Amino acid sequence: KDMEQNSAKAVVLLKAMANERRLQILCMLHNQELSVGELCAKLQLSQSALSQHLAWLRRDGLVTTRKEAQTVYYTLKSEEVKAMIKLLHSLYCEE
Amino acid sequence: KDMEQNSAKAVVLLKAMANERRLQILCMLHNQELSVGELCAKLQLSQSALSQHLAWLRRDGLVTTRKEAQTVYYTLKSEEVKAMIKLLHSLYCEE
């Protein structure tokens, strides 16, 4: 019943974070709002591939956007992902 | 440098948890030591497939074992996974 529904909900979030590039994006958005350009410069990633990771994180509800006429700013969306990144940040990001 | 080493270390742990069955096993081991039989009865899983999940979790350092002459008892191993399950438990396991 709920065991398979909650397990699925959590797995969706875990699968979205179980990627080196996707995790680095989320960790950078910890208590911070960044644009596509700011992420591109801080990650050495092509815009085409960076847009693919952002699309995956957006489709699964891990990040939400805000536009400043054409510039898109990204930020962590769900409280579950915010708590997940906060804990991971202290375990691996030295803070 | 460390960015790709720490990201890899965290991804290994996230990939191990990004599975409905593997996550249910870890959640059951939260502050609890259980044998193979106790897990088999509480999860409706075949012993062959349950041993495969336990082997994956063991190889990646998420669980460690203890034997009582022939009975194997499982428990969460790393402090990182213990903190991860503790947070997930409060977000989805209602406690």
Numbering used by the authors:
A (entry chain A), B (entry chain A): 4 to 98
Verbatim from the authors:
The overall structure of the CM14-treated HlyU is similar to that of apo-HlyU. However, there is an extra electron density map around Cys30 of the CM14-treated HlyU suggesting a potential chemical modification of Cys30. Although the moiety attached to Cys30 is partially visible presumably due to the high flexibility, this observation is consistent with the above result that CM14 modifies the Cys30 of HlyU. To this end, tandem mass spectrometric analysis was performed for the CM14-treated HlyU sample. Figure 6a clearly showed that the Cys30 residue (C#) in the HlyU peptide, RLQILC#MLHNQELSVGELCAK, was covalently modified by the moiety with molecular mass of 130.042 Da, indicating that a certain part of CM14, probably consisting of C9H7O, is attached to the Cys30 of HlyU. Notably, further comparison revealed that CM14 induces a conformational change of HlyU, thereby substantially decreasing the distance between Cys30 and Cys96 from 8.4 Å to 4.1 Å. In addition, we found that the distance between two DNA-binding 𝛼-helices (𝛼4) in HlyU dimer by 2.9 Å, which may account for the impaired DNA-binding activity of HlyU. Taken together, the results indicated that CM14 reacts with the thiol group of Cys30 of HlyU via a putative chemical reaction involving Cys96, and consequently inhibits the DNA-binding activity of HlyU. Altogether, the results indicate that CM14-mediated Cys30 modification substantially changes the HlyU conformation, and thus inhibits HlyU binding to target DNA. Biochemical analysis indicated that CM14 prevents HlyU binding to its target promoter DNA. Further mass spectrometric and mutational analyses revealed that a part of CM14 covalently modifies Cys30, a well-conserved residue of HlyU proteins in Vibrio species, both in vitro and in vivo.
